[PDB]
Structures are given as structure tokens and as C-alpha cells.
Amino acid sequence: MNLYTVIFINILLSLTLILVAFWLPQMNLYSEKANPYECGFDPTSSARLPFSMKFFLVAITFLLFDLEIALLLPLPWAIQTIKTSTMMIMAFILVTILSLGLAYEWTQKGLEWTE
Amino acid sequence: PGIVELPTLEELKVEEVKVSSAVLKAAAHHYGAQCDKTNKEFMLCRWEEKDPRRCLKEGKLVNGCALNFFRQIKSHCAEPFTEYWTCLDYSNMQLFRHCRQQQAKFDQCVLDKLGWVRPDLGQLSKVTKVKTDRPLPENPYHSRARPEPNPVIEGDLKPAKHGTRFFFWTV
């Protein structure tokens, strides 16, 4: 209840700040005021156009690695087990497999950016 | 189905220990050393007979043993125990390691009087046998009769009669 209360207090504080920031100062807006910024000239094309991504393979690898992190995260409770040999072997296997995948991608130039 | 049979408030009435958790944790090891037999009898009856209504007498005996234990402490070692559970109650976890001088003085008092010895590390946490006259429940799960298995067929494995008997195949 207390955490929910303080989250709501933060929400109310930030909403109050942005509300007073939008309703306190004098408004004077026209077309050139609200045109988008392109260092003084008109934009040649819209910014909603496709914008090429040179680290897409690294992003997919980040998805897989983040799930490897999710697998590795119950370790502070796993170290309390009776059969610590099995836990230690399984954790070693998991981290070694993750490292081998990273090494294979590094060898196959997947970490390098395209073009 | 049938109605559930549970005891009344008069059967559930007992002299409860109006004692805080810090006080209980201060007196924990000596309560586990002195009132061990009644407590182990109650745990044995609870883990044998799963029904809690079959162990009300043992629970009342446990409460009586705890009351006698605390009355003995109040009779003989009131002030060191009082300051000990106060210093325990200050901590949020009631950690034993924060108050060791008060623990030492309370242990000295309950050693020179009453002859009580604090249990060592690993003694209260081991499985102990216990003698009781309460009979072992033969059917604790109130299980019905298990259905009989299929009548397994025995005999020598003779060959198939007239081959496979698959349409016109002779063998």
C-alpha cells in the first residue's frame, strides 16, 4: 500500500509540474514556431521514413542474451541447495555455452556492424 | 456429504501465553531445551494424525508447559530476561548477535539458578525420537479400499493358431 502511495505521489507531482509548465507561461505559437527543427532549413523528407539499423544482429543476440540473464538470475537461491555439485556443474555449463555462443558470433563477425 | 465435526469454543478455551515474539525469541533456546518432550509429542501427533482436532489435549499441554516455563523465569530471573528481550526487541530482525552481553547475563542467571544450559549449535535442529502411548493411526488419509488390479493372465506362450490368420495368408 505504501509503495503504491509513493508511486501515486510521484505521478501526481510530475503531472502537477508538467501541468503548471503548460498553463503558467504566456502562449504565442504560429507556424514557423512549431515547424520541426532541421538546423535552420526545411526538412527534405519526413522523419517517419525507414531508418536503417546496422546492429540488428546484435539486437537479436541481445534478446537471446537477456533470456540467458533471466536463466542465470535464480542463482542466489540456487546456491542454497543441498546438491551444490549439480548446481555448480549446471551453472558452469550454462555460462560456458553462453560464452561459446558469444565467441562464435565474434568469430563469424556478427558483432561487427553492417556497412 | 456428511457434516464436519469440529469442537466448540469451550473445548478450544485455554490460558494463552500473552507473550510477544521478541520475548519468545529471547526465551527460545531454553524453551526448546526444557519443554522439548511435550512439544515433540504434539508435533508427532500432528504429523501422524493430520487432523488438528485430534491433538487439542497435546496443544493444551504445550501451552501449560510454556506457561510453567515463563512462570519459572518470572519467579527467578526476571530482570536480566526483561532487559534481554528489550534489547532483542529493539532490533528489526531481533538478531541475537546485537545483544550478547544481555544474553550472557541471562544465561549466567539461568545457569547458576535452575541449572539450565543453553543448547549448542545444531542441537535443537535434529530429529529426535519420542515415546508416546497414543496409538499409530492406521489410515491417516481416511482412504477407501483400493480397487483390485486386472486379473493378469498366466500360462505358456504357445504359437499363434494357423499362423497370423490375416485373410488368405497361410502362415
Partner: protein
């Protein structure tokens, strides 16, 4: 593909159905299905053409949706019964969703619309791997829950599978599409015999696999993707016309080929369970399947289509392509009808 990634991908392709068949837990069967799908996608898209990309995309989204429905059925069963197996009293809605999702994974009608398209645009060996290996694990899952399934929905799926497979095979000229509609019809037969006797499902699956493998190998000899391409086979490999004809007739279920045996014993078991109308309709649509097989035979073997001038140079060259396992599978799929009591259990 370097041998490291070849070993990883092929081992995971192998490991998927193996985990699915060996797994007691529904969740482990599901992750075996996930293994099979994820591992088989890169070999589908391995040629890196637009058709292969489209085929991989369609296969991925279809199998992902069907696997999500499977996972829904598993989670609902775990909610209802607290266990990880459809034991005996799981809900009929859960079982029907399981059947429907597994039929979409298998590729039988009316969930069959992707299978000729996925089979097109991929290389012939990947079509073989798909149409033989990828159906074993869903069939194993269906076989494990055979007494729980709904005969009405299964029979409807089977009869529409055989109908749509017969009509699609009748229309198509592309060899991969023809083999895919053949797969749809045979999967219809297997599903039809599934609730009554899964041993006959396994028998029909094994007969279909040992008939489909050498047909795909014979296609792989010259990369003949078309009726015309397989029609000029007399100039390229004249010694394969008889085995092509015999295997196509066995796929048609003509006696005395061993491919008549699965349809025959499935019809016999359906007659034992009094589904004569379904058996007769399935047999007539199997006759239609045999018709498009016979048209294929007319194109490749009994007549002789005109050849090209460069086929002379192809006859100048020599080939070592047909492997040792081709002839064994062709003979075992052609001349094994007298061993029918041994083939059945």
C-alpha cells in the same frame, strides 16, 4: 554453412522430434516442437531467394500460431487438473483445441493452405525433410492421446484433408506441390485411422515415408521440379522410369504394391468400427489421388516427351548421385505386400 552450424542445426532438427517422442511432460513435448520449428527455419531459408524467404515466413507464422494454441491447451489442462498430461478427464474443449492446433502444425485441410506454398520455393531435400521428418512429432503427440480425441471432428478433418489433397494434386503441375497434396491426402488417412488404431497410423506413416523418400531422391537426381522436367527423364536417367512408375502406383494404392496395404488395412479397421460411408468416400478420393499419379506416370514413363539438344552433353557427362539407400527404399516400398501380416501388428 560451415560444418559447425551444420552440425548444430541438423542435431537440433533431429533432437526436436526425439525430445517430443521421449517426453512424458506436455511442456517438454511442446519445447521439442519449438526445437523442430526453430531448427528447420534456417535450412528452409538457406537458398536466400524471395520464394524461400516467403516460404520460411509463412511456415514460421503458421507453426508459431499453432504452437501457441498448443500451449494454451497445455496451460488450460494444467489449470483444470494440476498435471502436465491430458490424463482422462481433461476438457473436451482443451482436447479439440489440441487436435486443431496439431492438425494445423501437420498441414491437413482445411489448415492445409500453407503446405503446397511452403513446399514450393524450398529445395527438394528440404521438402523431403519437411514432408517426412516434421510430421512424426505431431503424430506422436496425437497418438499419445488417442482415446481422448473426438471422432467426429477427427473424421471431418480427415475427409476434408483427403478431398482437398485429391483436388490439389489433380490441379498442380509443380512436383513439390504435387508431393505436398499427396502428403495432405496421406495425413488425412492417418488421422482417419488415428482414434481407432494408432498402430495403423504408424504403419501408414512408415509406408508414406518409405514411399516419399525415394520419390524425392529421384527428383533430386536432376532437380526436376516440373512435369516436363520429370518427363524428359528418359534421356537423362532411363533406368529409373520403372521404379518411378512402381513408386507412383504404390502411392496410388494399387495392388499388388505395398502402398495398397495402408489404405486396405485402414479401410478394414473402419469397417470393423462401422464407418462405411467415411471409408467409401475416402476410397473414392484416393482413386482421384491415383488419377493424378497416373497422369504423372503417363508424362514421365509410358510416353516419351521431346528432349533437348544439350541433353546429349548431359549424357556425355557421368553422374554418381543416386545413393545406396535409394534402391532399398524403392524395393521396400514396391514389393512388400506379401509381408503384410509382418508389416501389421
Amino acid at each position: 554453412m560451415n560444418p559447425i552450424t551444420l552440425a548444430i542445426i541438423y542435431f537440433t532438427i533431429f533432437l526436436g522430434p526425439v525430445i517430443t517422442m521421449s517426453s512424458t511432460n506436455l511442456m517438454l513435448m511442446w519445447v521439442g516442437l519449438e526445437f523442430s520449428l526453430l531448427a528447420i527455419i534456417p535450412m528452409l531459408i538457406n537458398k536466400k531467394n524471395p520464394r524461400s524467404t516467403e516460404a520460411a515466413t509463412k511456415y514460421f507464422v503458421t507453426q508459431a500460431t499453432a504452437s501457441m494454441i498448443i500451449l494454451l491447451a497445455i496451460v488450460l489442462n494444467y489449470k483444470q487438473l494440476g498435471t502436465w498430461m491430458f490424463q482422462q478427464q481433461t476438457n473436451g474443449l482443451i482436447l479439440n483445441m489440441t487436435l486443431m492446433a496439431l492438425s494445423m502444425k501437420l498441414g491437413l485441410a482445411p489448415f492445409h493452405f500453407w503446405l503446397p506454398e511452403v513446399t514450393q520455393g524450398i529445395p527438394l531435400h528440404m521438402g523431403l525433410i519437411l514432408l517426412t521428418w516434421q510430421k512424426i512429432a505431431p503424430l506422436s503427440i496425437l497418438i499419445q492421446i488417442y482415446p481422448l480425441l473426438n471422432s467426429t471432428i477427427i473424421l471431418m478433418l480427415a475427409i476434408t484433408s483427403i478431398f482437398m489433397g485429391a483436388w490439389g494434386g489433380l490441379n498442380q503441375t509443380q512436383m513439390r506441390k504435387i508431393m505436398a497434396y499427396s502428403s495432405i491426402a496421406h495425413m488425412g488417412w492417418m488421422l482417419a485411422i488415428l482414434p481407432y488404431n494408432p498402430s495403423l497410423t504408424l504403419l501408414n506413416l512408415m509406408i508414406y515415408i518409405i514411399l516419399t523418400a525415394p520419390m524425392f531422391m529421384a527428383l533430386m537426381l536432376n532437380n526436376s521440379m516440373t512435369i516436363n522436367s520429370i518427363s524428359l527423364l528418359w534421356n537423362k536417367t532411363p533406368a529409373m522410369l520403372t521404379m518411378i512408375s512402381l513408386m507412383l502406383l504404390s502411392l496410388g494404392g494399387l495392388p499388388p504394391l505395398t502402398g495398397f496395404l495402408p489404405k486396405w488395412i485402414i479401410i478394414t479397421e473402419l469397417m470393423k468400427n462401422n464407418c462405411l460411408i467415411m471409408a467409401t468416400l475416402m476410397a473414392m478420393m484416393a482413386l482421384l489421388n491415383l488419377f493424378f499419379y497416373t497422369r504423372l506416370i503417363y508424362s514421365t514413363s509410358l510416353t516419351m516427351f521431346p528432349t533437348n539438344n544439350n541433353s546429349k552433353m548431359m549424357t556425355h557427362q557421368t553422374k554418381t548421385k543416386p545413393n545406396l539407400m535409394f534402391s532399398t527404399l524403392a524395393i521396400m516400398s514396391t514389393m512388400t505386400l506379401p509381408l503384410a501380416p509382418q508389416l501389421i501388428t
